[PDB]
């Protein structure tokens, strides 16, 4: 039937071309948007007909209803709103042309309408047409009153049928525009740095690899812009930021897509204490600006589960990672430092076994700590919560803590048990940075395929003097999920990556 | 000797760590920017010393000059400005500490300075320190006063060359201006995939990459065009995206493998509407950023002559086929014959007669492109619209409503280079599928420039794309003309380099 629908409609549209009726006209001159039409003429009384006002509007037919032989109603949609077209034979250009256009049009067609504002006796705001023009026919049966995979594989159908979908992508745009205004107003320079690198850096991830033909070399898609940004701060650009795409060659799940958007910024002469204050101000201000208040309802398990109000009222709660983990475990942890050491790693491995906390190989100190933090601390972070002072073994680019041996000046911001920001006072001692890179190179050979490569170019830049600096990254897609009440990242990506069908 | 310098300074910094002197301190509390300091206190008279005001500033030492045993001047730089530090022992926290810090500091070091505004007898604005703190030593000898080093070590270029920062400020202003212009017109800023199963929307050789969990190759995008049009089918009438595109091709003065474009799509517009919007956007951008419609440009670099490029609207328009007939001095075939082998052979003969080179394949689209580059693009000094391209070179553009065989397309050229490409969008799915099938037949026959057919995109058109016009701009090339750069490496922070 839908296959039969398409064949018959394709044949009808082809016959319009043969007959010279031009079903894809080049230009229709719209006078006013549907949203403006509604705002201008909502004041009309029932039964009103403004015969002195002629306007041209356009949109998509979502319904067609005949009422006898001389009256047809079209439900015209656009911009997330709707306008009834009340087509009366007596008000049309001619009775013959009225019959002809109505027999041509179908639900789904894009049409242009020239006519007068009016309101039916039932109170429905309408345009009463003198002329309707087919602008682009719909050859398929448009669906009605869906399934998640089809919504993501044909996002244009999702946008046509589901008004809530457009609203999620408006919110996503408002988040990004808000962040640019905040950072621009603080004197940051928006920059663009390479997305293809000889050596990926700045994060822990498996990269995409590609080949450049003229230069005959493999290149990697970036996992983070962080090292380029720090080289620009060495160059004397004190405040920089970039909102752009990053790439991870891994699996797909509710919070993971192969390409995703982050904002990173770097601020000379700041430390991570300064960045916590800036983060609280930016995030709370953004939530209130976009949603109207600091409190946001969220369904962590989707509409079939319980919802919770998430409170963004500042200041945010702060916890220190190791001391809070020791309270949640009921026991003290062995101290860590820059070097992996088997005695400490075995103690943490034993703790994970006794607590039934899984950790896939390699069971390195940093990975075992990360799993323990996920099980015992991240689960308590419902309202925005800073988790602070990560061990150096987890943080190869973060500066050592100025008063806590073996820790770093780092924080992560968690909301509804998920990371949305990662930041730290930047490591700017080249000798120490080279030493941490050497530790990452060992752990890569031992089985950690996410461990960082040594970047001697970046270490050389540090030798010219990076000022004391703090940097920051935010996962834009995760923030969009929380502000749109989505628990699936596919809801906030226009064209999410999908397994082949 | 630079190697000796680095060995000696590295050992000295390692000694400071051993002695507990903390050469990379965690936090220095900057009070005021160097720029604000200069604005606030330039009014001082020579010899003034505001002993009641103390302020903290920071920056990089570019010069160090002793004057007797108790006075040292540091040239402190940052934010594109400079401030003299006039360190006399009489004002320093103590004479023993004054000797110690001055013996520690070297040109290139990042320092924090706490002190008072003042002006020397010779009238130089200065900060008179109570205390100076080493914040980050420079282990190498800082250079003073080829192009490869500037591009391979961009941070050194930024430290040494004040003009470089200004080029990237201008580049950012261009992008921010465009977003403001389109946001004000009701456009929605969107993000569409950079990794595609089928690259499309342009003629380009793509990068290919493997996704492991999906066990399939993906291509880096060459343009976002087809996704934007699907969003217009979805009912988002005005969309734009400023983002990166990728081309697996060669590098030259106007090409880099990754580059930035702005594309936008506007329902119920045609390409006449887009010419007016382009004129308003481009002329307004030039005036807002430079203060006038006229910009000086050196096409051959500073060694050559300069020309004022005039962006005052309206821009000149020329029609590709009619103007080519004038430039060649000969009638070309009627435009409804542009698909025939007879027309291809005529263009092939003309290229031979005029010594216009065209490497194989010698297709009509490629011979036309070479003729247009030789005879039309070179006349486009001021911004110039080249219009009404043949369909055979524009497979996604709508047929011209009155000129058979042409399309409703324009390209904007400035100083002989393309900066925009735009058209009334082809929205008839049967005709679009027919043009894709011709592309796929040419691709299978050996024409690598032909597009892949995109079935999902053609299916989307079957649901009804409203009449629409779309547009793309090469942001890097615009930044080149607004920074008087004739090499794209000047407007990319980290240009791709042969290793």
């Amino acid at each position: 039937d839908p296959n039969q629908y398409y064949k018959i409609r394709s044949q009808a549209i082809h016959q319009l071309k043969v007959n010279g009726e031009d079903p894809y006209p080049h230009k229709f001159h719209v006078d006013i948007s549907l949203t403006d039409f509604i705002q201008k003429y909502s004041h009309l009384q029932p039964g009103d007909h403004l015969t002195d006002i002629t306007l041209k509007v356009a949109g998509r037919i979502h319904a067609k209803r005949a009422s006898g032989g001389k009256l047809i109603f079209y439900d015209l949609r656009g911009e997330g709103v709707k306008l009834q077209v009340m087509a009366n034979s007596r008000n049309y250009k001619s009775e013959e042309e009225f019959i002809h256009i109505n027999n041509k049009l179908r639900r789904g067609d894009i049409i242009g309408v020239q006519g007068n504002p009016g309101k039916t006796k039932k109170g429905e705001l309408s345009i009463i047409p003198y002329e309707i023009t087919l602008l682009s026919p719909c050859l398929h049966m448009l669906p009605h009153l869906k399934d998640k995979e089809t919504r993501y594989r044909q996002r244009y159908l999702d946008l046509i049928l589901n008004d809530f979908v457009r609203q999620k992508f408006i919110i996503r745009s408002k988040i990004i525009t808000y962040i640019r205004s905040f950072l621009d107003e603080l004197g940051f320079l928006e920059i663009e740095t390479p997305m293809m690198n000889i050596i990926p850096g700045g994060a822990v991830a498996k990269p995409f690899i590609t080949y450049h033909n003229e230069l005959d070399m493999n290149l990697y898609m970036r996992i983070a812009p962080e090292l380029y940004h720090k080289m620009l701060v060495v160059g004397g650009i004190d405040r920089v930021y970039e909102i752009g795409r990053q790439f991870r060659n891994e699996g797909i799940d509710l919070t993971h897509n192969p390409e995703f958007t982050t904002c990173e910024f770097y601020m000379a002469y700041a430390d991570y204490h300064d960045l916590m204050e800036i983060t609280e101000k930016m995030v709370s201000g953004m939530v209130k600006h976009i949603t109207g208040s600091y409190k946001v309802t969220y369904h962590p398990d989707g509409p079939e589960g319980q919802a919770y109000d998430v409170d963004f009222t500042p200041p945010f709660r702060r916890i220190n990672m190791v001391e809070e983990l020791e309270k949640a475990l009921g026991m003290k942890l062995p101290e860590t430092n820059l070097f992996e050491t088997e005695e400490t790693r075995k103690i943490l491995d034993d703790i994970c076994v006794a607590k039934a906390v899984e950790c896939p190989p390699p069971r390195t100190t940093a990975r075992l700590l990360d799993k323990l933090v996920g099980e015992f601390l991240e689960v308590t972070c419902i309202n925005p919560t800073f988790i602070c002072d990560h061990p150096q073994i987890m943080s190869p680019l973060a500066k050592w803590h100025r008063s806590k041996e073996g820790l770093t000046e780092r924080f992560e911001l968690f909301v509804m048990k998920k990371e949305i920001c990662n930041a730290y006072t930047e490591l700017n001692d080249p000798m120490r940075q080279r030493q941490l890179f050497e530790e990452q190179a060992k752990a890569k050979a031992a089985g950690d395929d996410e461990a960082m490569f040594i970047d001697e170019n970046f270490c050389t830049a540090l030798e010219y003097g990076l000022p004391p600096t703090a940097g920051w990254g935010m996962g834009i897609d995760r923030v969009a999920m929380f502000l749109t009440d989505s628990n699936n990242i596919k809801e906030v990506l226009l064209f999410p990556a999908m397994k082949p069908e | 000797d630079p190697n000796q310098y680095y060995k000696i300074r590295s050992q000295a910094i390692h000694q400071l760590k051993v002695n507990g002197e903390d050469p990379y301190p965690h936090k220095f509390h900057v009070d005021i920017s160097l720029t604000d300091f200069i604005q606030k206190y330039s009014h001082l008279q020579p010899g003034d010393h505001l002993t009641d005001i103390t302020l903290k500033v920071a920056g990089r030492i570019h010069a160090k000059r002793a004057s007797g045993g108790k006075l040292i001047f540091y040239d402190l730089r940052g934010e594109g400005v400079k401030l003299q530090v006039m360190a006399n022992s009489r004002n320093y926290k103590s004479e023993e500490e004054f000797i110690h810090i001055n013996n520690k500091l070297r040109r290139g070091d990042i320092i924090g300075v706490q002190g008072n505004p003042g002006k020397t007898k010779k009238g130089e604005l200065s900060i008179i320190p109570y205390e100076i703190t080493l914040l980050s030593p420079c282990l190498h000898m800082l250079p003073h006063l080829d192009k490869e080093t500037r591009y391979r070590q961009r941070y050194l270029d930024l430290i040494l060359n004040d003009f470089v920062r200004q080029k990237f400020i201008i580049r950012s202003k261009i992008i921010t201006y465009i977003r403001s212009f389109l946001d004000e017109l009701g456009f929605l800023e969107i993000e569409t995939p950079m990794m595609n199963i089928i690259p499309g929307g342009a003629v380009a050789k793509p990068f290919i990459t493997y996704h492991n969990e999906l066990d399939m190759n993906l291509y880096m995008r060459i343009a976002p065009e087809l996704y934007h049009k699907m969003l217009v089918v979805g009912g988002i009438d005005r969309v734009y995206e400023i983002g990166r595109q990728f081309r697996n091709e060669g590098i030259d003065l106007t090409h880099n493998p990754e580059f930035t474009t702005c594309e936008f799509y506007m329902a119920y517009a045609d390409y006449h509407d887009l010419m007016e919007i382009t004129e308003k956007m481009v002329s307004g951008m030039v005036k807002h950023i430079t203060g006038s419609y006229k910009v000086t440009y050196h096409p051959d670099g500073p060694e050559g002559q300069a020309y004022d490029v005039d962006f005052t609207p309206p821009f000149r328009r020329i029609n590709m086929v009619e103007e080519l007939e004038k430039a060649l001095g000969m009638k070309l075939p009627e435009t409804n014959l542009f698909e025939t082998e007879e027309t291809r052979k005529i263009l092939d003969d003309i290229c031979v007669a005029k010594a216009v080179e065209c490497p194989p394949p010698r297709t009509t689209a490629r011979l036309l492109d070479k003729l247009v580059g030789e005879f039309l693009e070179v006349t486009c000094i001021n911004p110039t619209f080249i219009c009404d391209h043949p369909q055979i070179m524009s497979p996604l553009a709508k047929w011209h409503r009155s000129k058979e065989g042409l399309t409703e397309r324009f390209e904007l050229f400035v100083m002989k280079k393309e900066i925009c490409n735009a058209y009334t969008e082809l929205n008839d799915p049967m005709r679009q599928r027919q043009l894709f099938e011709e592309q796929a037949k040419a691709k299978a026959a050996g024409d690598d420039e032909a597009m892949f057919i995109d079935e999902n995109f053609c299916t989307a058109l079957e649901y009804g794309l409203p009449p629409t016009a779309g547009w793309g701009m090469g942001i890097d090339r615009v930044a080149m003309f607004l920074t008087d750069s004739n090499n794209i490496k000047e407007v990319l922070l980290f240009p791709a380099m042969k290793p």
């Binding site: 719209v30 006078d31 006013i32 948007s33 949203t35 403006d36 911009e79 408006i170 745009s173 408002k174 525009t177 808000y178 205004s181 905040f182 107003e185 603080l186 204050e277 800036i278 101000k281 201000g285 600006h289 | 946001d183 004000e184 017109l185 009701g186 929605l188 009438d237 005005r238 506007m266 119920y268 517009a269 509407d273 007016e276 919007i277």
Partner: peptide
């Protein structure tokens, strides 16, 4: 000229983000 469409920011007033702030100081009377 193309028909008017209001900006997605609403069109009322330009966005004025809340920024970090610093408590002012009064001078030492001594």
């Amino acid at each position: 000229p193309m028909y008017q469409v209001k900006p997605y920011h609403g069109g009322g007033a330009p966005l004025r983000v809340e920024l970090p702030t610093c408590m002012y100081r009064l001078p030492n009377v001594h």
